[PDB]
Write a protein that binds this ligand. Structure first.
Ligand SMILES: *[C@@H]1O[C@H](CO)[C@@H](O[C@@H]2O[C@H](CO)[C@@H](O)[C@H](O)[C@H]2NC(C)=O)[C@H](O)[C@H]1NC(C)=O
Ligand SMILES: *[C@@H]1O[C@H](CO)[C@@H](O[C@@H]2O[C@H](CO)[C@@H](O)[C@H](O)[C@H]2NC(C)=O)[C@H](O)[C@H]1NC(C)=O
Ligand SMILES: *[C@@H]1O[C@H](CO)[C@@H](O[C@@H]2O[C@H](CO)[C@@H](O)[C@H](O)[C@H]2NC(C)=O)[C@H](O)[C@H]1NC(C)=O
Ligand SMILES: *[C@@H]1O[C@H](CO)[C@@H](O[C@@H]2O[C@H](CO)[C@@H](O)[C@H](O)[C@H]2NC(C)=O)[C@H](O)[C@H]1NC(C)=O
Ligand SMILES: *[C@@H]1O[C@H](CO)[C@@H](O)[C@H](O)[C@H]1NC(C)=O
Ligand SMILES: *[C@@H]1O[C@H](CO)[C@@H](O)[C@H](O)[C@H]1NC(C)=O
Ligand SMILES: *[C@@H]1O[C@H](CO)[C@@H](O)[C@H](O)[C@H]1NC(C)=O
Ligand SMILES: *[C@@H]1O[C@H](CO)[C@@H](O)[C@H](O)[C@H]1NC(C)=O
Lengths: 140, 601, 140, 605
């Protein structure tokens, strides 16, 4: 049980913990740090997954100042000729990858957001990891 | 009196009863008399001697061939006379003598061949003249029109006027202050003399379905050169002869009139595009198309100077791409074609009505959807699927927002109204919103009216989703499948006056959630399944409460619920339609008014 | 009281009766007669309404072999600059008009269709008339 | 605590997972009958001879990320049944010549990221049974296939993606020209490919070639495609990765080299470059039998109106300015799914079309449905689920052959305004679940005499009452009425449904369980009554269930557990063998018993 400080931005303070028993080392860099007002950057990930990344998805359980959001299910790898090269990664294969991202357009209330990210992949699809992001949002 | 008494001492329907003559058995104080569809055939002097008080006399379809001098002499108060559909043969000058209050004269289909032989020169109070559907051949207004100094509406449509000459307008040239709206629709017009409308000013001209062909239209419009019209209505009628073509030259002559507002009402010809078609109307302050078909609509990216654009009941291949710097008000309603919304750029826009199109709207709503930061009013009701992906960034000035009956999606995925600090009115009724986020209404600090009838809540539970909405005076949660309330759901709502909980699935009345409601006047709990009050908090209704609707509930009329049942009687003053409160559940008492029940065991 | 037989086609046999107290004569002619598998033609109406046709609409109450359909509201006249010229027609005015029609593309069950057409018009809107159309339909 | 622990027994005697357990040696504590062994993520480091003697039965062996540095002769010698061997992510420094002797049944060899530098010295020549070789994520610079490939007679999949191949020469494929049984799929994605020699793939026949993200630039791409000239490929997959270096431009000349191969099926999988339009882009693929775009962006889709001879068209996860106008004479199967952007459906002209999947686009459909929307009378399958508002204006005229219709989660309108399904005399499967259909017309299902499966969960009914709208549906086997706010049943609603096997009444608003409406359901096996508000039931109304009933789900109802309802509680005990997840059947009242399982209830009545 340790807290992993990711980055601070002009908007946001981002850290995570694990929410699973078997806390496989993961390395997550974000350049530049996420500004909730909207930003673009690179997500760097170094990971040795204990299952194939085939059909990766995230269940996301988000909380805003204590208020829960409905689960979102975010499909990352659809299964066949996927957009992302890491979708082809196997159990035990080095994933050392850079993923670009972009968004704008949503005002967020000031405060504390949690995001339980439950990654799921494989054939009898099982949990890959569970991370709990805390994002402190101080707007402007 | 076989006449119907519509309003005692005031209004009588003597319609279609075989009257050969005028009723003499009616109050002296009759204000509105309808004598339509009787074989009167003939009106002699003082035919209405009996009705000194008469204001509205309807004589439609009375087979009247002759009206004598002083037929209406006694009716100094008559403001409306209706003579529609009488085959008038003889009319003497005194026919309308004595109508010194007359403001509205309807002589539609009265076998009228000329305005010259129409004795109305002395009705100086006359505001509307309807002589539609007659045999008038000439647009020459008689000399007596100069006496008609209050005339505002002249209906000359469905006559036989083929041409208009300059000398026709002489009288109007001598009346520079006349505020005239003129309908010349459905006249087989083939010629208007150029110069005839030079220095003429009309409030309104409607010219629908006047022309056989495009060339005839163009020539007659040239004949309008110099006209000043506040509001020009062109077009035609779906059930008549229509223009065979309509090209970019159709409205060329409009460049020579001064038009404030323009409407094209119905066009049979399917337009390909509007490139050049309307460039004579570039600086009209109000531009309206109704019932027009246009496939290619990218032509609206042209920078017209319109301030009001109205597109109603049209058919577009694609939603039109609007880039208009000066447009303040847009009404795009009841259109029925290509209908995914796409970004418009409208920097002056304060008022957007985009309702009743069955429009699709991906990723609502943002200043980059509309190009304005000045939006005050947004109607997106009666549309298709509206997906929420932006919580009104740049639309902070919105006061009215209406989504009623559109299918709203993603409403629980973030605070979709977060930005809307100035919103006063919000309707999301029947939007298929299942509330599953407690922050759904965050941001709405100025909100006063919230209607969300016909939706639903996770677990049929009403949570504290209102705490930020201190200014609510009106809340509609009817038809929301609600079963349970947070006791603190309404806690902060001290200005709430009207709460609608009708048509839910509550089985008991708990008055606890309502105790902090100092302003509550009306609470509607009709059409639920209330049978008991379980929490004996029956006591904490606010003193302010005046109307408690408990009708159409499932009252259990047994000794076990005596307290509630008693309480019902204790304050029948608050209760609204006491009779419509009937026992449901002991089958032997089923039907019986609750306030009639026997309260001894 | 009586059955006013309008026309027969290859598909259909159309007639009507009145469903109001004030059984005002209308003349309804259809050319050519309606074939339910789809037709175009001209509807000729001669009528003199006992109210203005302003804001005319029809409540349609349709039945298919005893099976009731929900009420349809069909707005004919919006009230301002209407498509159809008869929208302008007043209480005592001869309406003598031709309305083109056209449709296709609905399979209908064999049998008896009734359609109550309740015409309503005017501001303070009242019943113009009620007609109960029977249409017998034998496909092909 | 068993002898095989800490390993996890996935399937007794058969499959053991010994993943990440600090095993320094092949465990000795497992059954000799073990067929599937997962030993991934263990510090095994070294694999000497006969390392798996204990596992003569092994078929699947996973040694991923086991730090294995050296594998010696015979290391797997006893495993003559092994078909799958997984070596991913082992930094192999030394690999003996006989490393894989004894692997007489090996069909799949995964050597991803095992520090492979060359296939030449890679000791696998003797594995004639090999169907797939995966050597992705290694350091191979040369596509020279070694001569022992002539031996790999059953090789169906070769993965060389994520290696270091820059060039492919004619003489690199010398071995393939000698080779018989060809169902060979080749992945060459993510090799920094700068040159392929014209002639290299002349008279080569491949089942599948994947070449994604191989090319630094458009010109290098064009160059390399020319080197494919004369290739015969059943399936060609081009494109690139979103998280990867991408082509900066992409014009009409980009695929011009495809005119020189024979391609049965084509896919372009992800393109970074926004395409203005596709004029001339796919000219070499006009007669490919299957054409697929995934994750590509196209503004002007006007150019899809061209009469390509495709039999199968697939457009998925794309962004289109508008719904494409499609006029394809030979198209049998259309998949247009998960797309974004322009999203009002407009009529297509597809006279050969039998299979139509239009799901998950958020599409609006202004007037559905009939032959004139699609241009075909041959449609058997129509998927229009997960879209926007679909206004029903036609009851499937011309579509009489439809067997499968899915509208799930699309907002249907006008469903009660006529018999919208009347033409569908052959429909077998209909899903109108969560379509916001408010049933107000008893003829809503008229015409559906072949219907077997009817899903209509999450809608509602006039008066929350189930009327007799099913009497014509004699062939029904599956009916889903869950989440329909139902309160009352017509005692007659189900009388005709004597073939019904599964009836879903879940998540409605019933307070009692009346068995009477179900008495004629002679085939009823599964009846789901969960998540209602069932609190009691009269003895008499409990007696009419057909004895075919095998699964009754009464979980998560509001059982009242007083002596007043002893008959119902008793009846529940009696039907225990029909009841599902009885743990989840709990007393809602009184508070004395709230949360107590109904079956274990302690009451004296
Ligand atoms: C609360 O909402 C209901 C509808 O949810 C309203 O009920 C309407 O009331 C009028 C007059 O009482 C009826 O004639 C209509 O038929 C009703 N509509 C429906 C759908 O029932 C009710 O008026 C609202 N209450 C208040 C106080 O505004
Ligand atoms: C329950 O009673 C209330 C109060 O008498 C009714 O409220 C009226 O509803 C209509 C619109 O729905 C409004 O125009 C009136 O202004 C309301 N009256 C008052 C006093 O505010 C309500 O309609 C009744 N509900 C029913 C019959 O469902
Ligand atoms: C009947 O329909 C309901 C949905 O209305 C199905 O319920 C789902 O079932 C699985 C368990 O099999 C749950 O994990 C889901 O969460 C349930 N969905 C809910 C509660 O909305 C149910 O499976 C269906 N019954 C049958 C026999 O098919
Ligand atoms: C009620 O009980 C039955 C258990 O028999 C559940 O039905 C299963 O549902 C799943 C997924 O929904 C299907 O794949 C299985 O085929 C079903 N089994 C049978 C025998 O039909 C049902 O899910 C339960 N309902 C709820 C809401 O939990
Ligand atoms: C990850 O990849 C980059 C780019 O190929 C490489 O240079 C870097 O050393 C790698 N990082 C690690 C930690 O292996
Ligand atoms: C004008 O009206 C007055 C009465 O209001 C009348 O005396 C006079 O004759 C009228 N003039 C003309 C020209 O008709
Ligand atoms: C109706 O109008 C047409 C002209 O459009 C005319 O020929 C016909 O006589 C009229 N019918 C009646 C009954 O007046
Ligand atoms: C082919 O594989 C066999 C195994 O049966 C092996 O003995 C031989 O070395 C290989 N072929 C040739 C031509 O050497």
């Amino acid at each position: 049980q340790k807290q992993y400080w990711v980055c601070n931005s002009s908007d946001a303070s981002i850290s995570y913990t694990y929410c699973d028993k078997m806390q496989y080392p993961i390395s997550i860099n974000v350049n530049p740090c996420i500004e909730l007002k909207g930003s673009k950057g690179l997500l760097h990930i170094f990971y040795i997954p204990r299952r194939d990344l085939k059909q990766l998805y995230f269940n996301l359980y988000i909380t805003v100042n204590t208020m829960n959001l409905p689960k979102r299910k975010e499909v990352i790898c659809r299964g066949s000729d996927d957009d992302y090269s890491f979708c082809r990664a196997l159990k035990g294969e080095t994933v050392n990858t850079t993923i670009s991202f972009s968004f704008k357009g949503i005002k967020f209330s000031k405060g504390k957001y949690k995001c339980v990210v439950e990654a799921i992949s494989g054939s009898p699809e099982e949990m890959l990891f569970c991370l709990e992001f805390v994002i402190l949002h101080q707007p402007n | 009196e076989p006449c119907v008494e519509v309003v005692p001492n005031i209004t009588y329907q003597c319609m279609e009863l075989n009257f050969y003559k005028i009723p003499d058995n009616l109050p002296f104080s009759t204000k509105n008399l309808d004598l339509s569809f009787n074989p009167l055939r003939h009106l002699g002097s003082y035919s209405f001697f009996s009705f000194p008080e008469l204001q509205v006399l309807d004589l439609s379809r009375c087979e009247i061939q002759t009206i004598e001098d002083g037929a209406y002499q006694s009716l100094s108060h008559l403001s409306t006379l209706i003579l529609t559909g009488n085959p008038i043969q003889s009319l003497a000058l005194g026919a309308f003598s004595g109508l010194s209050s007359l403001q509205k004269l309807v002589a539609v289909e009265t076998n009228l061949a000329s305005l010259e032989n129409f004795p109305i020169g002395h009705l100086k109070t006359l505001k509307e003249l309807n002589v539609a559907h007659n045999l008038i051949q000439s647009f020459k207004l008689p000399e007596y029109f100069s006496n008609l100094t209050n005339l505002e509406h002249l209906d000359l449509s469905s006559n036989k006027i083929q041409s208009i000459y300059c000398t026709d307008l002489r009288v109007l040239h001598q009346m520079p202050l006349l505020n005239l709206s003129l309908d010349l629709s459905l006249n087989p017009m083939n010629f208007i003399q150029p110069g005839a409308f030079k220095e003429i000013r009309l409030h309104k001209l409607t010219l629908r379905n006047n022309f056989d062909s495009l060339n005839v239209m163009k020539t007659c419009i040239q004949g309008l050169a110099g006209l000043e019209v506040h509001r020009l209505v062109l077009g035609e009628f779906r059930n008549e002869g229509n223009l065979e073509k309509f090209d970019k030259s159709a409205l060329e002559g409009l460049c020579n009139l001064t038009i404030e507002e323009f409407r094209l009402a119905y066009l049979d010809y399917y337009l390909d595009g509007i490139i050049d078609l309307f460039n004579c109307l570039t600086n009209v302050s109000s531009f309206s198309l109704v019932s027009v078909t246009i496939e290619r609509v990218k032509d609206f990216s042209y920078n017209f100077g319109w301030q009001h654009l109205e597109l109603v009941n049209c058919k577009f291949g694609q939603f039109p791409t609007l880039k208009l710097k000066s447009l303040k008000r847009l009404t795009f309603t009841s259109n029925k074609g290509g209908n995914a919304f796409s970004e418009v750029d409208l920097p002056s826009l304060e008022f957007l009505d985009l309702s009743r199109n069955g429009l699709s709207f991906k990723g609502c709503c943002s200043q980059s959807d509309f190009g304005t930061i000045s939006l005050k009013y947004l109607d997106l009701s009666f549309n298709g699927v509206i997906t929420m992906s932006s919580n009104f960034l740049g639309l902070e000035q919105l006061e009215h927002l209406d989504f009623q009956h559109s299918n709203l999606k993603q409403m629980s995925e973030f605070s979709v109204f977060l930005s809307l600090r100035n919103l006063i009115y919000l309707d999301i009724s029947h939007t298929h919103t299942r509330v599953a986020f407690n922050g759904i209404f965050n941001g709405l600090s100025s909100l006063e009216v919230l209607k969300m009838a016909g939706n639903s809540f996770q677990e049929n539970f009403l949570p504290d989703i209102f705490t930020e909405l201190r200014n609510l005076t009106f809340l509609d949660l009817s038809q929301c499948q609600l079963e349970q309330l947070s006791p603190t759901a309404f806690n902060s709502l001290s200005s709430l006056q009207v709460l609608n909980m009708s048509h839910n699935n509550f089985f008991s009345l708990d008055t606890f959630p309502y105790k902090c409601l100092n302003s509550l006047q009306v609470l509607d709990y009709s059409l639920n399944h209330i049978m008991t009050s379980k929490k004996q908090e029956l006591q904490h209704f606010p003193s302010s409460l005046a109307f408690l609707n408990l009708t159409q509930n499932d009252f259990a009329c047994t000794c076990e619920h005596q307290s509630f049942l008693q309480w019902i009687k204790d304050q029948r003053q608050l209760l609204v339609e006491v009779e419509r409160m009937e026992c449901a559940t002991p089958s032997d008492k089923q039907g019986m008014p609750v306030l009639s029940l026997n309260i001894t065991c």
